[PDB]
Amino acid sequence: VVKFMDVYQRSYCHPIETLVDIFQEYPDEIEYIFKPSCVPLMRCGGCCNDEGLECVPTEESNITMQIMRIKPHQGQHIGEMSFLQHNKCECRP
Amino acid sequence: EVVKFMDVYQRSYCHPIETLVDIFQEYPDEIEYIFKPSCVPLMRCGGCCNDEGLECVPTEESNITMQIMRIKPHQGQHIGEMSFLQHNKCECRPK
Amino acid sequence: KEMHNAYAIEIALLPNLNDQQFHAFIWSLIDDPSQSANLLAEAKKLNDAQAP
Amino acid sequence: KEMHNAYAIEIALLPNLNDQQFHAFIWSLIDDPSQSANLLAEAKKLNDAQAP
Angle between helical axes of C2-13 and A4-11 (0-180°, round to 10): 80
Task: Look at chain D and count its residues.
Answer: 52
Q: How far lies A24's CA from each of A31, A40, A55, B93, in Å?
A: 13, 13, 20, 23
- CATH code for the domain of D23: 1.20.5.420
Q: Where are the alpha helices (DSSP H) in C1-52?
A: 2-13, 19-31, 36-49
Domain that holds residue D15: 1-52
Residue A19 contacts residue A38 (beta carbons within 8 Å): yes
The count of CB pairs under 8 A between chains B and D is: 28
Q: Resolution in angstroms for this experimental structure?
A: 2.5
Structural domains counted in chain C: 1
d(CA A67, CA B39): 33
Beta carbons of D13 and A76 less than 8 Å apart: yes
Q: Which domains does chain A have, with CATH numbers?
A: 1-93 (2.10.90.10)
Handedness of CA C13, C15, C16, C18 (dihedral sign): positive
Q: List Cβ neighbours of B63 (8 Å cut-off, separation of 6 or more).
A: B83, B84, B85, B86
Residues 6+ apart with CB under 8 A from B43: B16, B17, B18, B19, B64, B86, B87, B88
Experimental method: X-ray
Cα angle vertex D43, ends D37, D47, to 5°? Answer: 145
The one-letter amino acid code at D35 reads Q
- Across the interface, which of A4, A9, A49 has its CB nearest the CB of C9? A4
**What one-character DSSP code corresponds to residue B13?**
B
How far apart are the C-alpha atoms of A80 and B12, rounded to whole Å? Answer: 16
Touching subunits for chain D (3+ Cβ pairs under 8 A): A, B
Rounded Cα gap, residues A12 and A31, in angstroms = 38
Q: Can you state the percent helix, strand and coil of chain A, rounding each to 5?
A: 15, 60, 25
